[PDB]
Design a protein around this nucleic acid. Sequence first.
RNA 1: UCUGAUGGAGGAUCGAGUUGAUACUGACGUGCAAAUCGUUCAUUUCAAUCACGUUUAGGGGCGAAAGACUAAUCGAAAAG
RNA 2: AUGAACUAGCCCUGAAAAUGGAUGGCGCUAAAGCGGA
RNA 3: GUCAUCUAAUUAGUGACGCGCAUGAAUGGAUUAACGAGAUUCCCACUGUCCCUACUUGCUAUCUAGCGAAACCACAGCCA
RNA 4: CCUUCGAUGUCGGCUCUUCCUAUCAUUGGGACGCAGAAGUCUCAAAGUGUCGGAUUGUUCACCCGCUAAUAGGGAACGUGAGCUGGGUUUAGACCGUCGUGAGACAGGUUAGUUUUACCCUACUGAUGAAUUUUAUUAUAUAUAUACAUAUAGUAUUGUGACAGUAAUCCAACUUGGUACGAGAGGAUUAGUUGGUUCAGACAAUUGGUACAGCAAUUGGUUGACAAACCAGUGUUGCGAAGCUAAGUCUGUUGGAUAAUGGCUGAACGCCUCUUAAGCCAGAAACCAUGCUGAUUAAACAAUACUAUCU
RNA 5: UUUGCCUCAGGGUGCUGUAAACAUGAAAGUAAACUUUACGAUCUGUUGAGGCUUAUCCCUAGUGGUAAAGUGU
Lengths: 380, 62, 132
Amino acid sequence: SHRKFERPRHGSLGFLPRKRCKRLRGKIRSFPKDDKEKPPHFTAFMGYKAGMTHIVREVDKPGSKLHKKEIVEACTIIECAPMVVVGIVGYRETPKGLRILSTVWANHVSDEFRRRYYKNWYKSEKKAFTKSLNVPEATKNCLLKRIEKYCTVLRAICHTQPSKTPLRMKKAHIMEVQINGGSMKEKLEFVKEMLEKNLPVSTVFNPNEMIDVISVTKGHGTKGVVSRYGVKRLPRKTHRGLRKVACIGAWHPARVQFQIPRHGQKGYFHRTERNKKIYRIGLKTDKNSASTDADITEKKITPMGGFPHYGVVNEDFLLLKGCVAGTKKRPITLRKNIVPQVSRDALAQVSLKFIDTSSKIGHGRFQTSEEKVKYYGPLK
Amino acid sequence: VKTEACSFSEYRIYPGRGQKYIARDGKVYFYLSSKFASLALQKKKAAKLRWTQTWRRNNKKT
Amino acid sequence: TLKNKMRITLSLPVGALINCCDNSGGKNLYIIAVQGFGSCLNRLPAASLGDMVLATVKKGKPDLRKKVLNAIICRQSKAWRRHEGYYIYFEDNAGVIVNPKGEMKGSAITGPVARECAELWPKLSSAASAIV
RNA sequence: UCUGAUGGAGGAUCGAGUUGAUACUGACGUGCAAAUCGUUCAUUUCAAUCACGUUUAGGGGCGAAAGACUAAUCGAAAAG
RNA sequence: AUGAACUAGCCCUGAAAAUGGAUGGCGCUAAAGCGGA
RNA sequence: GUCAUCUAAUUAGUGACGCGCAUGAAUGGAUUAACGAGAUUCCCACUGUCCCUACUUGCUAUCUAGCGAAACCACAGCCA
RNA sequence: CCUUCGAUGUCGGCUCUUCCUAUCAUUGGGACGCAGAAGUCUCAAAGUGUCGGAUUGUUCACCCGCUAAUAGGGAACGUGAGCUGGGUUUAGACCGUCGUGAGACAGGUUAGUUUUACCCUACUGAUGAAUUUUAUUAUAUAUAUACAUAUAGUAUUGUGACAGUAAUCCAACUUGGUACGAGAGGAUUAGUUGGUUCAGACAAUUGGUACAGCAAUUGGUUGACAAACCAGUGUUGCGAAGCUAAGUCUGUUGGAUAAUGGCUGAACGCCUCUUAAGCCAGAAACCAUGCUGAUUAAACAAUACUAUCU
RNA sequence: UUUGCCUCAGGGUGCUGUAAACAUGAAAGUAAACUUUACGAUCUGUUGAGGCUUAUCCCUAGUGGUAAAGUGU
């Protein structure tokens, strides 16, 4: 018979199977739809999760109970050292999907890039990408002309530079960033110009821009159905334990349905979250990356004492409004929105007044070590 | 940046950090951390706590 | 007349005994229901600062007892975050008795009143002495 | 008649031990165990508890009575 | 060549149930359906 | 059952009413202080019983070396 | 009385999922005895949601209240090797009535052991080879070739068939005291700010947590101080880190349609949305988009380097 | 897997809350000598001290180390 009382099901069936992700790197399922009018541009980037802080900003929402007050917002810091563009891939449309015509490489690729091709780079003799980089410019241009002739989707292979980060991992993270923009010829030329140089975050994104983040959630091993699906605990009197689903199906069908919550892996899932706004693109060069016009204090983003479990952000970075899936040191893919957003929130110009850099270990009371020593005075 | 002052300790509270407690009489207190809130809620006087700025000033030590 | 309360941490579920903090005659309010609470299977209806609740009086004037009457929370002991960046809380839970329309049954409010409640209910703010 | 001591009665009270077994309808339930384990609980000057000895034997015994018990066997034991 | 009223073939409405589903299945309409020869 | 009371709300509780299916006097009637691991309703205190779960400790589980059963079994083991 | 009496665990609730539509609300329509507001009848529609409590073992009921709504049902009266055991339904016992009696009682009451999964499958997660009578949406300098091409190892970047899929509802204010109305009242739609329920994350802050760590302290013990130690974590404050919600962040737009309203337009000189041909607009539905998986395709591509090799 | 990493140390950042020792130092008071000597919970100074801080905190071309090369193709 029917349920006495209705209530919605536990968890979403759209994120099944809740199995471990194939890879650690976030992977774009689909790039934003190409608009032929816009000039050619990159659509994606990759950084590493450094940590989180909070900022103070002035709201500009008329009719909102906040409006003219200064509110505190949680922000995630993503260390975005420039990538290197190393290759070009052309895709053509076939009834069986996208088919690669060819991928052409740059003349020089870093050992950081070549490391990704090895499980034991240290004891190998690093012969990868050694004799295929001496191809003549004639055949390179032939392949490029064929790509321009027949391909409809252009992507640029680019790789991160983990040496610029505090990461222990040395092999770079490689992906392909789809070039959205003008004609095929314009895309080809756009990527050919910067076929070997650095790609900073500033070229890909702008401040106050809404983006999407693709990354693998924090892992938790096997978790019970209570913590994995949110099912209700059984009463205290339950004979064989209470942390389980009581009925895992009706008598018929004489099977367990795939919609029934069970124990299993929790976390380490691939998630693509939409609409994280960029609050600031901090530059490696400047000494006041964490300063504001209402702060005028000379300070950088890294909190007093380092980013816990991460290190120090010595490179370009971006300050993302809100939270982002993954642990510290996790590679995080940033993607342009599938269609440009025109909402008030997406179009707003954030003007932050203060960026916190107190210690995130313990309860820090100082923004700078100079301030701490000034307050305490001389010691033993 | 305009910081406030703790009521138990004298430490400066930067924005987005502390917590407020307003008493039965309606007068407000600001506490930097859960520790200071804990002591103030057990009604420990900061004057008798050796590490506090109140104690330091009271023993002419600053 | 503007009901954009902005979410406040839910304290005071159904069955809470709070003070009256007004001169209506009642001494405490026993929360019976929370206005606007929808449907959720085992969820207890719970109230926040500006919320209107249904309550009965368990101590006070007999003409106030043994009846269902409206109340508005004014002081909440559960710490809640206001967007300036800090957390705040009172010690007692307290609400005043009001007409369904929202106007106070009494004439004065004893202790402080949260600013969130005050801007939601103007005549209650006018009756209030200290707004915090 | 009242007040203070003294005195040390009672199938008096609390409570370890002993003797039991209220609840968790806990554990265990292919047990450590054909009745145990943990916590909780009842009981302790008396109709109290224990030992050994001794008497009552099967349509019989014995029963502060549940058809209880009478060698893991009882609305008629066990053996042939 | 007009207007009616009947008649009876096929078709349609009347025709709502619980796992996903059954002219046996695919499918079939210049039938691979219906009534004949 | 009806009327009160208890609650915001009472097939519960208590107090009354009594043409009582089918109450009633050692088949004992009515009432009772004290007593109860007896049944029941309410109140204060209290709390993870619950809103609504989270974190944590031991012993298992888990992997390993060693040791090593049993129940069950026509044949077997995807569905409409 | 067909199947089960060499046993299919017999009420309810709790938990959890799925399904139906005879739709309660939400979407978009048609009618009205339809001015407005509210409402009633009715269509397409099952995407989303259908609550907190008092009494009762209860289903049902009936009240209190919130709600947008508190619709009705199925799945062995879904669900007892999932629980619970209040009821029913053994043995103790009490009452009433019946019986000479032993005893009976859809009459009431009280107390009364809830066993087993390590097997197969299903489901949930986790490793993983092998795959030629196999595969190909090409490969070759405006030009041939299936009479062809394809080794294998590592490794990266991809393709993405197919399967799953997700958001939902509300309030306040403005439009507006406007349209409408004799007044009384009083919208729709759009916009703004919020919020519920749900989903996916996260820990800057707040809170929780403690067999990191410091400190205090009771009893005991080492002659004392110091250092400790024992008390199944001795007990207390605070308590980083890490987990964590009660805390924080995020949650699209296209196509093609249904109902319905229409266009042109015969049949049928007129008329007719077509109950012919030919068209249009159109819904929380549908299919995509987006998201998750893809040893779900025993799938495949491009690349890098190489194995005496050819 | 040798501009790496592990280790310990130094530094940072925090947590706790001022270590041991010493003082013709204080201390409610007490007792014992012909104005000093003993006992004393506790307090003070040196002392925001001391301890701890990655084991899943941060920095350092700081110390020491970085091991046999076994299997498959």
